[PDB]
Amino acid sequence: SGFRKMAFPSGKVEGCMVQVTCGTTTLNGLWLDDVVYCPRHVINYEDLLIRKSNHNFLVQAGNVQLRVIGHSMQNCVLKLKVDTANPKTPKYKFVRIQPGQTFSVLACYNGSPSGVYQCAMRPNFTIKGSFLNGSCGSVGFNIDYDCVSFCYMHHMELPTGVHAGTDLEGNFYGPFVDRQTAQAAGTDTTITVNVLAWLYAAVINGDRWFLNRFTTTLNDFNLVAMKYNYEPLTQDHVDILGPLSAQTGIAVLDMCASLKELLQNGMNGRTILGSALLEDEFTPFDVVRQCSGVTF
Amino acid sequence: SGFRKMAFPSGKVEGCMVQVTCGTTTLNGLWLDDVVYCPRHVICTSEDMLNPNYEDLLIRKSNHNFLVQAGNVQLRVIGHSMQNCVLKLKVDTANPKTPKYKFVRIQPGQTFSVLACYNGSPSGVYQCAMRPNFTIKGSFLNGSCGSVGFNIDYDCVSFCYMHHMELPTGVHAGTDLEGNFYGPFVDRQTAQAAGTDTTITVNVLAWLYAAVINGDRWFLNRFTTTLNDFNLVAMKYNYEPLTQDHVDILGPLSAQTGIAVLDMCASLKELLQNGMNGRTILGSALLEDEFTPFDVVRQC
Numbered sequence: 267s268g269f270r271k272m273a274f275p276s277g278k279v280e281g282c283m284v285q286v287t288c289g290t291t292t293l294n295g296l297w298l299d300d301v302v303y304c305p306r307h308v309i310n311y312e313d314l315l316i317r318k319s320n321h322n323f324l325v326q327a328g329n330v331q332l333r334v335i336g337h338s339m340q341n342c343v344l345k346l347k348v349d350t351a352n353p354k355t356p357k358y359k360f361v362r363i364q365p366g367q368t369f370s371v372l373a374c375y376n377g378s379p380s381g382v383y384q385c386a387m388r389p390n391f392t393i394k395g396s397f398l399n400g401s402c403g404s405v406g407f408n409i410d411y412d413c414v415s416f417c418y419m420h421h422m423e424l425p426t427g428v429h430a431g432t433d434l435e436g437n438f439y440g441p442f443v444d445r446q447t448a449q450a451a452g453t454d455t456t457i458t459v460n461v462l463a464w465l466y467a468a469v470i471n472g473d474r475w476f477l478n479r480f481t482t483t484l485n486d487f488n489l490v491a492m493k494y495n496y497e498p499l500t501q502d503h504v505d506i507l508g509p510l511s512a513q514t515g516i517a518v519l520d521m522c523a524s525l526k527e528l529l530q531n532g533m534n535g536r537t538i539l540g541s542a543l544l545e546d547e548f549t550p551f552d553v554v555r556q557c558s559g560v561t562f
Numbered sequence: 563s564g565f566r567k568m569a570f571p572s573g574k575v576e577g578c579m580v581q582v583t584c585g586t587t588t589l590n591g592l593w594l595d596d597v598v599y600c601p602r603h604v605i606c607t608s609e610d611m612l613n614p615n616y617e618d619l620l621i622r623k624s625n626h627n628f629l630v631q632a633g634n635v636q637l638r639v640i641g642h643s644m645q646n647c648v649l650k651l652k653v654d655t656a657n658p659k660t661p662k663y664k665f666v667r668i669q670p671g672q673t674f675s676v677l678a679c680y681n682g683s684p685s686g687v688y689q690c691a692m693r694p695n696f697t698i699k700g701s702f703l704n705g706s707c708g709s710v711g712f713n714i715d716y717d718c719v720s721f722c723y724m725h726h727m728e729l730p731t732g733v734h735a736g737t738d739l740e741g742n743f744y745g746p747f748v749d750r751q752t753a754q755a756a757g758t759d760t761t762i763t764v765n766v767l768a769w770l771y772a773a774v775i776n777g778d779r780w781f782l783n784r785f786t787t788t789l790n791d792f793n794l795v796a797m798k799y800n801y802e803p804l805t806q807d808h809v810d811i812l813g814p815l816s817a818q819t820g821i822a823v824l825d826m827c828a829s830l831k832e833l834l835q836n837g838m839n840g841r842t843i844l845g846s847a848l849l850e851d852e853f854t855p856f857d858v859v860r861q862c
């Protein structure tokens with residue numbers, strides 16, 4: 267029993283964090299094989315990069331300086347070719363995630379991991395992270411068996427305190443640019459499929475007060491959901507919620523009628539899994555993984 | 563900016579998780595140097611669990627009865643001893659991934675990261691607080707026994723908890739790494755209940771200072787309070803008493819934000835009286851008590 271915001275074990279990623287210094291700027295880099303990936307703002311990026319030489323980039327893996335033997339840019343990520351392959355390189359992939367998907371963030375400062383937390387890619391493409399100056403280059407990831415899927419690299423903090431970054435190919439999530447200019451996070455919405463997954467987790471843990479005899483059509487639920495700034499629930503979401511629906515004996519459209527009532531009436535001084543708000547940062551897979559005990 | 567429930571990076575602890583099997587039972591062990599630490603109830607059956615005599619059960623065991631597995635490598639147990647509720651299995655190989663570590667016993671209100679494991683394999687890491695009733699509101703399924711709680715300040719791993727049991731309310735009980743249980747719990751299946759839980763007042767205040775550091779001031783007020791008047795109001799909402807130590811501890815955050823500790827105490831009093839009014843503090847509609855003053859300073 268128990269339901270916690272749980273991050274993936276960060277060990278495979280910790281062995282990859284390095285410190286990248288270029289001029290006055292110091293941020294984090296991801297050392298995989300003989301390449302160090304980091305935000306290109308560490309340095310007109312084509313013009314700024316051409317002026318740099320390999321010895322300008324000081325890379326440090328622990329107390330060992332890695333010598334840069336080449337550099338190239340891929341979108342908003344700088345790829346620094348190093349002479350030494352990372353002996354701690356795990357099995358990895360670069361994956362681009364969709365809004366609503368969750369990942370673990372290994373927050374780093376000066377190439378040293380300081381903390382790990384579970385995030386969600388918001389529907390407005392920002393992440394509500396916890397980052398201070400020097401956290402740029404910190405990565406987001408998931409673990410599948412023994413494979414690390416890198417999905418995020420931190421680049422900036424928007425004026426509202428929310429964070430923006432790219433996938434490991436340097437493509438930003440959201441309409442953001444790596445430039446000091448006026449940029450604002452769009453109005454955010456609630457990840458509906460994730461809220462339903464968290465309601466199933468609450469039922470698995472013994473919380474049933476919110477359940478009701480009612481059901482709803484997928485269309486009627488989406489008309490209500492749109493009114494409360496909730497993302498539309500697709501047939502794919504209903505299908506993905508299948509396992510949890512079968513395990514608890516509560517159909518997805520039956521849980522949608524509970525969600526609809528929670529939206530129109532509130533909690534009424536009650537909590538669900540120790541929360542007075544509807545939690546949307548657990549995917550259906552996160553609930554299954556935690557309420558079954560999958561290991562890495 | 564931003565305030566998240568943040569766990570310590572678990573890498574230093576992952577390199578220590580092993581699987582310990584004894585008879586039908588399989589749980590987790592912590593392999594540090596040439597010793598594997600694990601809950602002593604690994605030597606029990608459900609027929610023993612009501613009134614186990616661990617000294618008697620242990621004397622009947624031999625080293626080859628304990629099957630220890632570090633990854634896909636079976637370790638050889640060359641000795642065993644019991645220290646309180648933890649079994650110490652001497653093995654013939656020192657763990658090459660043994661980090662710099664300490665065994666620390668924590669006080670209620672203290673936080674730590676939990677590396678939840680099954681079959682010696684890490685499945686997840688989350689943050690916990692030792693509740694005032696000495697339980698932890700963890701996330702553990704069967705097979706998680708032996709999963710450890712820790713803090714990682716300055717490259718050293720301070721092990722503070724080893725998971726042993728789940729109480730009937732879904733909360734968890736365990737020991738420090740010397741085998742001493744936190745709370746009035748015993749490693750027996752006899753009737754045991756967690757005492758009434760209370761909110762960790764100093765942690766709530768630390769989280770209100772974190773909210774002020776992050777720009778949330780809506781809950782602040784023009785009032786102050788005496789420490790005694792605050793405690794009289796606090797006890798009525800099932801909040802732990804705030805001691806002069808807690809007030810002293812909150813000093814740095816008070817100086818950084820310019821809000822006197824007893825001034826923040828008066829804001830807490832008001833929140834307890836009025837609730838949030840549809841507002842949130844750091845993305846929460848409840849007063850959060852699982853961030854210590856040290857956690858707030860570290861993260862902010």
Ligand SMILES: O=C(C[C@@]1(C(=O)Nc2cncc3ccccc23)CCOc2ccc(Cl)cc21)N1CCN(CCCO)CC1
Pocket residue numbers: 267586587603604606607608611702703704705706707726727728729748749750751
């Ligand atoms: O898992 C246990 C320990 C056990 C316990 O609490 N285990 C668990 C821990 N966390 C989460 C759980 C989630 C669901 C179910 C069990 C969980 C069983 C329940 O009661 C106690 C009372 C005291 C003590 Cl110290 C330990 C326990 N055992 C079963 C009994 N025995 C194994 C012998 C084979 O039957 C020994 C091992």
